[PDB]
Short mmCIF file of C-alpha atoms and ligand atoms in Angstrom, two decimals:
data_model
loop_
_atom_site.label_atom_id
_atom_site.label_comp_id
_atom_site.label_asym_id
_atom_site.label_seq_id
_atom_site.Cartn_x
_atom_site.Cartn_y
_atom_site.Cartn_z
CA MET F 1 -13.41 -3.04 -25.24
CA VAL F 2 -11.47 -5.98 -23.82
CA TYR F 3 -12.53 -9.11 -25.66
CA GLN F 4 -13.68 -12.01 -23.50
CA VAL F 5 -12.33 -15.32 -24.78
CA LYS F 6 -15.12 -17.91 -24.88
CA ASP F 7 -13.12 -21.16 -25.20
CA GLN F 8 -9.78 -22.48 -26.42
CA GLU F 9 -10.73 -22.31 -30.11
CA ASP F 10 -11.72 -18.68 -29.61
CA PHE F 11 -8.43 -18.06 -27.78
CA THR F 12 -6.36 -19.52 -30.62
CA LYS F 13 -8.45 -17.46 -33.05
CA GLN F 14 -7.62 -14.19 -31.27
CA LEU F 15 -3.89 -15.03 -31.05
CA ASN F 16 -3.72 -15.61 -34.82
CA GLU F 17 -5.70 -12.47 -35.67
CA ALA F 18 -3.36 -10.39 -33.45
CA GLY F 19 -0.60 -10.88 -36.05
CA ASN F 20 2.68 -9.59 -34.60
CA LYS F 21 0.98 -7.46 -31.91
CA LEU F 22 1.49 -7.92 -28.21
CA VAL F 23 -1.45 -9.74 -26.64
CA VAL F 24 -2.24 -9.13 -22.94
CA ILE F 25 -4.52 -11.75 -21.36
CA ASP F 26 -6.30 -10.86 -18.09
CA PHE F 27 -7.06 -14.09 -16.25
CA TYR F 28 -9.74 -13.05 -13.77
CA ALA F 29 -12.57 -14.31 -11.60
CA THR F 30 -15.88 -12.75 -10.57
CA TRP F 31 -15.04 -13.34 -6.89
CA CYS F 32 -11.86 -11.27 -7.22
CA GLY F 33 -12.17 -7.74 -5.83
CA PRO F 34 -8.93 -6.27 -7.20
CA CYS F 35 -9.97 -7.62 -10.62
CA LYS F 36 -13.18 -5.59 -10.37
CA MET F 37 -11.19 -2.51 -9.35
CA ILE F 38 -8.72 -2.54 -12.26
CA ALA F 39 -11.40 -3.56 -14.80
CA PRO F 40 -12.46 0.01 -15.80
CA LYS F 41 -8.83 1.15 -16.11
CA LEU F 42 -8.10 -1.86 -18.34
CA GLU F 43 -11.09 -0.86 -20.49
CA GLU F 44 -9.83 2.67 -21.09
CA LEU F 45 -6.36 1.28 -21.81
CA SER F 46 -7.72 -0.95 -24.57
CA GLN F 47 -9.58 2.05 -26.00
CA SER F 48 -6.44 4.22 -25.95
CA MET F 49 -3.93 1.62 -27.11
CA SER F 50 -4.81 -0.01 -30.46
CA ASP F 51 -1.23 -1.22 -30.79
CA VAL F 52 -2.02 -4.02 -28.30
CA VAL F 53 -4.67 -6.76 -28.18
CA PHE F 54 -6.37 -7.05 -24.77
CA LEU F 55 -8.18 -10.29 -23.98
CA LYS F 56 -9.68 -11.58 -20.77
CA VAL F 57 -10.45 -15.07 -19.50
CA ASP F 58 -12.94 -15.91 -16.75
CA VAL F 59 -11.09 -18.78 -15.09
CA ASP F 60 -14.44 -20.22 -13.97
CA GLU F 61 -15.88 -20.26 -17.51
CA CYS F 62 -12.65 -21.33 -19.26
CA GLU F 63 -11.17 -23.75 -16.70
CA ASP F 64 -8.97 -25.61 -19.16
CA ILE F 65 -7.35 -22.40 -20.43
CA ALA F 66 -6.52 -21.42 -16.84
CA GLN F 67 -5.07 -24.86 -16.13
CA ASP F 68 -3.04 -25.01 -19.36
CA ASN F 69 -1.40 -21.71 -18.36
CA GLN F 70 -0.86 -22.79 -14.72
CA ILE F 71 -2.61 -19.72 -13.33
CA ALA F 72 -2.05 -19.38 -9.57
CA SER F 73 -2.81 -15.73 -8.65
CA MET F 74 -5.96 -13.72 -9.25
CA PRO F 75 -5.63 -11.80 -11.42
CA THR F 76 -2.77 -12.93 -13.69
CA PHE F 77 -1.83 -11.00 -16.83
CA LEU F 78 -0.09 -13.08 -19.47
CA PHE F 79 1.99 -11.36 -22.17
CA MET F 80 2.16 -13.23 -25.48
CA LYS F 81 3.64 -12.22 -28.84
CA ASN F 82 4.14 -14.20 -32.08
CA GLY F 83 3.04 -17.37 -30.32
CA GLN F 84 5.55 -17.04 -27.45
CA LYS F 85 4.92 -16.35 -23.76
CA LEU F 86 7.04 -13.32 -22.93
CA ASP F 87 5.98 -12.24 -19.45
CA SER F 88 3.51 -12.61 -16.62
CA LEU F 89 2.08 -10.35 -13.91
CA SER F 90 0.43 -11.53 -10.68
CA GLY F 91 -2.05 -9.16 -9.05
CA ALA F 92 -3.95 -6.07 -10.12
CA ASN F 93 -1.13 -3.48 -10.15
CA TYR F 94 -2.14 -1.15 -12.98
CA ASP F 95 1.09 0.85 -12.98
CA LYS F 96 3.18 -2.32 -13.26
CA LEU F 97 0.87 -3.52 -16.03
CA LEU F 98 1.51 -0.31 -17.96
CA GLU F 99 5.27 -0.78 -17.48
CA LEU F 100 5.14 -4.38 -18.67
CA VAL F 101 3.03 -3.40 -21.69
CA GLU F 102 5.70 -0.89 -22.70
CA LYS F 103 8.50 -3.39 -22.05
CA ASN F 104 6.95 -6.15 -24.18
CA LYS F 105 5.25 -4.33 -27.06
ZN1 LIG J 1 -16.92 -23.13 -14.16
#
């Protein structure tokens, strides 16, 4: 299951518990159709790939997280590791997501 971050404290908590693992954060909105389409594929990915932490952020429930990360496209996937931002992906391209997961893990 992809873990839904609840607030900033929760977000910091998940980043620390990830250790040295790649963390992929799906910034999404409930009005976003592509986000709904890739959502089941992202679920199976998190079930298949325990070597990566998959989080998601509802931009409308966690507005300040979205603004701190200057989100501008829906969806946006942020790639973080050991406290550093490594990469970003705009849009719901699942094959590019898989390629960026492999690149950054
Ligand atoms: Zn709101």
